[PDB]
Paper text:
The I-BAR domain protein IRSp53 is a key player in these processes, acting as a hub that integrates signaling cues from Rho-GTPases and phosphorylation pathways to initiate cytoskeleton and membrane remodeling events. In the inactive state, the SH3 domain binds intramolecularly to the CRIB-PR domain, resulting in a compact, closed conformation. Here, we show that phosphorylation of two pairs of sites within this region triggers the binding of 14-3-3 to IRSp53, which inhibits membrane binding and the interactions of Cdc42 with the CRIB-PR domain and cytoskeletal effectors with the SH3 domain. In all the structures, the phosphate group on the phosphorylated side chain engages a cluster of basic residues in 14-3-3θ, consisting of K49, R56, and R127, and additionally forms a hydrogen bond with the hydroxyl group of Y128.
Therefore, to study the binding of 14-3-3θ to the pT340/pT360 and pT340/pS366 pairs, we determined five crystal structures, allowing for direct comparisons of the structures of singly- vs. doubly-phosphorylated complexes. In contrast, the Sites 2,3 (pT340/pT360) and Sites 2,4 (pT340/pS366) peptides bound 14-3-3θ with ~0.5:1 stoichiometry (i.e., one peptide per 14-3-3θ dimer) and with more than two orders of magnitude higher affinities (Kd of 45 nM and 67 nM, respectively) than the corresponding singly-phosphorylated peptides. This result suggested that these doubly phosphorylated peptides occupy the two phospho-S/T-binding pockets of 14-3-3θ. Importantly, the structures of the singly-phosphorylated peptides display distinctive features that are recognizable in those of the doubly-phosphorylated peptides, for which the electron density is asymmetric in the two pockets of 14-3-3θ. Although the sequences surrounding pT340 and pT360 are closely related to each other, they are distinguishable by the presence of two large side chains in the Site 1 peptide, Y337, and R344, occupied by smaller side chains in the Site 2 peptide, E357, and S365, respectively. These distinctive features of the singly-phosphorylated peptides are clearly discernable in the structures of the doubly-phosphorylated peptides, in which each pocket of 14-3-3θ binds a different site in an asymmetric manner. In the structures, ranging in resolution from 2.0 to 2.9 Å, the electron density maps revealed the phosphorylated residue and 3 to 5 residues N- and C-terminal to it, whereas the ends of the peptides and the flexible linkers between phosphorylation sites in the doubly-phosphorylated peptides were unresolved. In contrast, the titration of acceptor-labeled Site 2 peptide into the 14-3-3θ/Sites 2,4 complex did not produce a FRET change, suggesting that both pockets of 14-3-3θ were occupied by the doubly phosphorylated peptide, and that the singly phosphorylated peptide cannot outcompete the doubly phosphorylated peptide from either pocket.
Residue numbers in the entry:
A (entry chain A): 2 to 230
B (entry chain B): 1 to 230
C (entry chain C): 336 to 344, 362 to 369
The structure:
Amino acid sequence: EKTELIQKAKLAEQAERYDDMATCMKAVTEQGAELSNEERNLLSVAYKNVVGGRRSAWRVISSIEQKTDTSDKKLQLIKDYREKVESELRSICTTVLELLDKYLIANATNPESKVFYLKMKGDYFRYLAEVACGDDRKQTIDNSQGAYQEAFDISKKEMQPTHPIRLGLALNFSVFYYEILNNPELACTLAKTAFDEAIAELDTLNEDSYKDSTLIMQLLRDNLTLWTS
Amino acid sequence: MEKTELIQKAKLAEQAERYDDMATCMKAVTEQGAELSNEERNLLSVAYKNVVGGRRSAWRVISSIEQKTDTSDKKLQLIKDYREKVESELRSICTTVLELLDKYLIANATNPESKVFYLKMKGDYFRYLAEVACGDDRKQTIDNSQGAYQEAFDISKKEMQPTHPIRLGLALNFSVFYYEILNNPELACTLAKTAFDEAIAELDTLNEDSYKDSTLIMQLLRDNLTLWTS
Amino acid sequence: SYSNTLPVRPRSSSMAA
């Protein structure tokens, strides 16, 4: 029964207890049945908030480290802490990715959820790439790229440019081009393409999904303005 | 780990918004038996206030959801069990804090600043317990909160000027205790109002070091007064 | 600054941090 688990997941969401939420959705996912759209959103929100605190913490600690004098006696404590945080982040991303490869992607039945999960794969492989080094960094960046590319093609073939999932995939994939590959022009072109194509057919968009698509598009042109500086 | 490095990691954890680690550090420092500076005490307060706060807010959300109508006895059972789990966590946190206070901090403080700070803290966490308590446990928790608060209040009034930030914050939290725990809005209003009036009375003589804090606290007193006058 | 990405993260006033 996923019903009680979903109930608890929503309670946790409103209570901002995202560990509990991620537990609930992990259990549901492991029951083996395909996830509905609300349930996919619950999974994504849960693990997004779990990993988020560690991404931000890691950013802070790393910033402090790289602005600390190398001869400082207090450097190794900073290092050790950053490495602990990084370890937790790796643990979480690995959990998500195992959930995707073992359950969700293997059993996804419609293009919407397949694109959703592939996008997620790219997102969390990207979260790993942000903190990886050496060959590990090469291969993790590669996996992220591949997930994003597959999801991108499928979205182009099976969805409208106004679909919130397609738009979000374009947003995050552009950010992958900017922060990871370091090609700001291509990231700008992804964002602008998605935005223009969305406005073109904004009239074929669902009233209920309107708020979501609008939100994403605003993030897209926000990114565009930023990067163009 | 040495006290110095424990502090270093408490501050680093605070920068990282990782308050469980911060609270663990400061708990270690406190258990080492060493008296804490003002800075270190504030690290303790920030850490544990952040740890407990999430539980308090979650408990509020879940409780509110529990009062929703037309809900299945089954779903209601699930909601209540979750609220009970959060309750358990909260009680554990407040318990740890109070064990630190009674066992180390309050015990080894003759200094009025520290004595008032720790007694106030005790009143705070016993209040956090009182807002989720049942039956006789409830009356005991309330009496303990009120007692600690009262002792802090007396010590402050005998040892600290009205403009001092701990005296003011103490007045603030003690009056919120009167309003929310004892449901005596009149005495809460007079408590906060007396604090504020006594502060403004001696504001021109306040030093420019504690001005920044006591002004903010005073503004909180007035906020609560205005809110409590509907 | 950090680029934006899709999935993102009355009472009485007591003494604060």
